[PDB]
Design goal:
The structure is a homooctamer. The first copy, chain A, contains 2 helices and 11 strands; from the N terminus they run H-E-E-E-E-E-E-E-H-E-E-E-E. The first copy, chain A, has about 180 residues and is α+β, with helices and mostly antiparallel strands. In chain A, the strands form 2 sheets. Chain A has a 6-stranded antiparallel beta sheet with strand order 3-2-5-6-7-8, covered by helices on one side. A 5-stranded mixed beta sheet of chain A has the order 4-1-11-10-9, with no helix packed on it. The termini of chain A are far apart. Chains in contact: A-B, A-H, B-C, C-D, D-E, E-F, F-G, G-H. Bound molecules: Sphingomyelin C18 (A1H8M) (11 copies). One Sphingomyelin C18 binds next to strand 2 of chain B.
């Protein structure tokens, strides 16, 4: 009989749902990824993988001694409950290895936190899910609590830090083992 | 009897539909297509095909050694569920062949992803659906996961990459076989 | 009896109609018409015809060797379902002929597409409906799919292209038969 | 009995009427009138008449060889269905005649179109309704379809054009009979 | 009984009245009054009268050979149906007379039009209602239809014009009888 | 019984009252008070009184030959029906007297108008209500109708004027008796 | 029974209360406190107390001969009925005393007014409630009515003034007894 | 029966709750932390801990004699009732100790106030909850009431101050024991 009650229930439902989708569309995640080639070797064949999120730009094809990658990963547009998570990688012909760098800026800080890592892999490889799993679970990732340092092997080491924010910054310097960081 | 219930159902219907059409009108797709003539040959007769989308500008008629195409493909205006997908092509008189470059930035990332390709075709040809089908299905397109390289034949090769975003960037360098990319 | 139902039907009707007229008022059509006098002859008596649309400016009275027309045709203001369609023309005293250039940027891309053309006509003539019909139906117009070239006769040729967008650009170079375009 | 139906009919009526008056207040008409004194004689006693519309500025009192009038006629403010229509005039002591220039930018392009004219009148006269009627009905006005030229007599001629838009531009050059226009 | 009908009649009444007062508050009248002392005599004791309207600034105390008054009369703020109407005056010690300048920019162009005047009065006098009545009714005011000229006596003359707009401009040059205006 | 009629009467009452308080909060009064020390004596101990209104700034402590006070009195914030009315004063040690300057910019121009005055008082005194009453009622204030001049005594005179607007300007020059104003 | 009357009473209540809290959040109080060290002694250990309000900045640690404190006290954010009231203090090692400066910009000008003071206290002390009570009640504070001057003792004096506005300015110069203020 | 009362109770509930969450999302807390290395020793391995809040940036890896940390802690985004509270730390190789600096800008000033501290700890340590507890409860923190100074030991001391605002500033200078602060 009282069909106006069903119309009012629809107006309440879409009036809630349009604002709920507008919330998930407006919560934002970023990672300003800076990686600095202090290494004395040329990096090439710039490769990426995204477990979540995207970027609007390319990596440099190559990086050379004293220059840096700057890259801007972000969350996918629209009402998605996913952060920005991924790998970037470069081949290093002068040592026969691939440098891979991982970051993980989640959506829910109830369950997760900002993590990052870097490693050298044998031969020419490009960033994929097996690099994400190995950099996130098998290796020890670093968390967003200031500056950390580790040997890469093959005469290199990395020094780096990440913000605890969801609009994060990541900075890494890939030095020779002889050098003092920053 | 209660005609106000039909008026309230119409207000609910158009109140939903005006916002649904406003959604499809505001989700946007782009491809910033850069193609760089490192080739040592003049390109001419700049031609295009669009399977979906448009651009507000012309290609250069010609490109010459060390200059680049910059072109801005985009989605068609209004409430359409179509991305930007197309071909650009140039004749190369010095080798008797047509360079064609393809990109595909879809609407639904549920079903599709960003793809691109480039190839040399025999004689003077202009971009059309047969170049789109051959660059997308018969040849192997490259996906949006960093830098890729392939020989074109006739002394040329291409090196290029594409963003995974729907507001994409595409960059290609069309080098001689003797050269090192970027 | 229930006169409030007629008032609510009027509020629904004008609430729809004010938004429908606002839609047709906001969908826009343009043609940025550039025509370049590479011809070695002075053009004069700049004339126009509009089958649909207008412009807020005059043509140059005359154009001379190495200068260009730039002209901005547009859709008529308000809730009209018409594009921008027209002819511009110039007399060329040094050959005894009229150059006429046509463009057609439609409203409905369901039924129509962007077309353009150029031709030389005998004697001093000014742009009118007979030039529109002859440039659109009797001659072969060119479509918005990259660069096209044709001989005009009397020692001239044209080279030109048009955008597939509804906010189009048109570019034409009117060269001598001896020259290489752009 | 049901007085709320009369209140709802009043809210509908003023809700329509406030938007109808806002429409007529926002449709705009202009004429950017440029008149260029290439004549070799000083013009003085700058006079105006408006059949419809106004301007917020004065004419120059005088114009001299190689300078120009620039004048900005416009529609009267508020919800009026009238365009901008008028005459400007100057006395020319060196020939004993008055130059008068007319323009007519209508409201309804359903019934009317953009017209303009210019003429020389005997003795010192100022712009009035008899100049409007003689320039619009008795003389042949020119329409908004590109550049037109006519002899004034007394060793002068005019060359000029007008836009077909309702936010029009009018340009006139008042040359000696010896000269080539623009 | 049905007191909600009286509340709805009040909401309709104040909903109309707030918009009616907002209309009368937003219709604006101005006069940009420029008066230029080409006279060879110093003007002093700058005086004003307003029959309607105000200004936010002072006159210069004095004006001297080759300088000008610029003054910005305007309508009184808020929902008043009155224009800007007034007199400015200066004493001229070198001839023993007061220059007075009048303007009248009305509210209703249904009943009134833009008028202005200027005159010399005997001795040191300051602008008041008797100067307004004598400049508007007893003397012949000039209307807003281009440039007008008259002798003041005492070796002076004025040349001037006014806009027909309600946001008017008034320009007057107060020359010696020997000179040619502007 | 029908308690919704009392709620609707409250919504009408606060819907009116919030707009009435917003009106009294937005009608504004100012006085840009400029006072110029052409006097050849130093002024010091800058003092103020406000009968209505305030300022956000201090007076200069002192003023010296050829410098000026600039001061910006204004209406008190919020829904108050009061203008800006007050006194500023300075001691002049070189003559043993206090200069006091008064202004009165009212709220209701139905009952009041812009008045101002200046006077010299014996000894070191600071601005207070007895200076306001003596400058406004016992002395002859000047009204907002152009430039006025009066002797102060002790070898000084003042020359000054005030705007008739509620956002007024006041300008005063405090000269020696030997000098000609502005 | 009629539960919609309780919902309408809640909508009226929160519709009033959200606007009442927005009023108390938007009425603002400030004191731009400038204190100028004309004293010939270094000030150090810059200390503060707030009876009401806060600032977003630090005092200078120290001030030295010819430099000034500039400090911006303000009201606490949100719907609080409290002004800005406080003390700033500095130790002066060269005389063995603490300079303390007090200001009081209230919320309710119905009950209170702008007051300020300054004094020298024995030994190294920091601003607290006992300095506020002694500067406000036991000593004679100065009110916002122009420039005031007093001896501090120990060879110093202060000269200063405060605005009567709630967005106040306070200026104080701390001179030697030999000097003439500003 | 009357289901519209439940819909109206839902509209009231979400209409309140959307504004309550918007309040907690818009109340903001910051700490602009400046720490100045006047110490004559290099600081390195910049480390952080957050008990509440985040930052969008990294610390410098290292700081050296005469340079400063500038760091911008802030509240976590969205409707959370938590301030910004944390520790930053650096290792100092030249003395074998870790400098740690703490700040605490709360949400509820009903229960808490702005506190800060600094201390030297033995060996290379990184900021964590045990440094927060020791700097906040076991050591004596300083409150937001002007400049404070303390010996660190190992030849160093700190001098610093903090704002009482919730958008706070913190400034610390880490001097040698020989020096005079700021
Ligand atoms: C309930 C929440 C828990 C749902 C859990 C987990 C994640 O797998 C993904 C995206 O992960 P991420 O980008 O947020 O962070 C990166 C975390 N890893 C890198 C994977 C370790 N969430 C969703 O699909 C949202 C599901 C739908 C949630 C609505
Ligand atoms: C609602 C439709 C109202 C809106 C908008 C028009 O302005 C643009 C014009 O598109 P354009 O400027 O990019 O030109 C591209 C056209 N070509 C690709 C070159 C063929 N929409 C279309 O044409 C088709 C949309 C048609 C919309 C499809 C129907 C949606 C449901 C109604
Ligand atoms: C259901 C969705 C599935 C509908 C499928 C497919 C596409 O054919 C086209 C436009 O394709 P595209 O521009 O998005 O991407 C390019 C993809 N290819 C390049 C063709 C390979 N979609 C539509 O006509 C929307 C239909 C109406 C959808 C509403
Ligand atoms: C149904 C749509 C079909 C209606 C058809 C055709 C056109 O004649 C004109 C304006 O044409 P045009 O400016 O859009 O494009 C140019 C096309 N030609 C150059 C003429 C070839 N449309 C209207 O009068 C809108 C009618 C009313 C449509 C509402
Ligand atoms: C029905 C429309 C037809 C009403 C007709 C004609 C015009 O007389 C005038 C103003 O003319 P104009 O400024 O628009 O254009 C200039 C046209 N002439 C220069 C006169 C030739 N219109 C009105 O008074 C609006 C009447 C009221 C229309 C509502
Ligand atoms: C509603 C009234 C609320 C509004 C506004 C006031 O701010 C201005 C002040 O005008 P003013 O700043 O230009 O000073 C000019 C006054 N003089 C010419 C110098 C005498 N309105 C008036 O004074 C009279 C308006 C009075 C409005 C007349 C009554 C309208 C109906 C209520
Ligand atoms: C009915 C309209 C007719 C009402 C008539 C006449 C005028 O006296 C004054 C203000 O005149 P003015 O400033 O507009 O123009 C200047 C005109 N003179 C210089 C006086 C010649 N109007 C009002 O008081 C509005 C009355 C109330 C109108 C509402
Ligand atoms: C509603 C009241 C809410 C509003 C606003 C306050 O912010 C300003 C402060 O004024 P002020 O910043 O200019 O300082 C000038 C005060 N003195 C002149 C120096 C004494 N209003 C008042 O004080 C009195 C207004 C009181 C309003 C009078 C009552 C109106 C009806 C409620
Ligand atoms: C009824 C209006 C008549 C109410 C009268 C008079 C004035 O005493 C004061 C403020 O005066 P003033 O600042 O506006 O102008 C200055 C005028 N004097 C300098 C005093 C000569 N008004 C109020 O308290 C508003 C009362 C409440 C009005 C509401
Ligand atoms: C009723 C109003 C009267 C309430 C009275 C007095 C004041 O104690 C404090 C804050 O004072 P203050 O910052 O405004 O001004 C400074 C005044 N002294 C410096 C203290 C002298 N007001 C409140 O707590 C608001 C109470 C709640 C008022 C709502
Ligand atoms: C009831 C309020 C009282 C709730 C109490 C205390 C705090 O533990 C935390 C966050 O503290 P803080 O960042 O605000 O300030 C720092 C204070 N300490 C540094 C811890 C000393 N509050 C909450 O979790 C909000 C609980 C939910 C409150 C809603």
């Amino acid at each position: 009989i009282a069909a106006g009650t069903i119309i009012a229930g629809a107006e309440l439902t879409f009036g809630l749902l349009q604002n709920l989708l507008y919330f998930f569309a407006n919560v934002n995640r970023k990672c300003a990824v800076g990686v600095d080639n202090e290494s004395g070797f040329r990096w090439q064949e710039g490769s990426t993988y995204f477990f979540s999120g995207t970027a609007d730009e390319n990596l440099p094809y190559s990086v050379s001694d004293g220059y840096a990658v700057l890259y801007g990963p972000r969350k996918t547009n629209g009402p998605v409950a996913t952060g920005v998570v991924g790998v970037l990688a470069y081949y290093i012909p002068s040592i026969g290895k691939t440098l891979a760098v991982m970051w993980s800026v989640p959506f829910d800080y109830n369950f997760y936190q900002n993590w990052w890592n870097a490693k050298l892999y044998s031969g020419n490889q490009r960033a994929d899910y097996d690099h994400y799993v190995d950099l996130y679970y098998n290796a020890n990732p670093f968390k967003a609590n200031g500056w950390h340092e580790r040997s890469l092997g093959s005469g290199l080491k990395f020094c780096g830090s990440m913000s605890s924010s969801g609009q994060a910054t990541l900075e890494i310097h890939v030095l020779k083992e002889s050098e003092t960081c920053m």
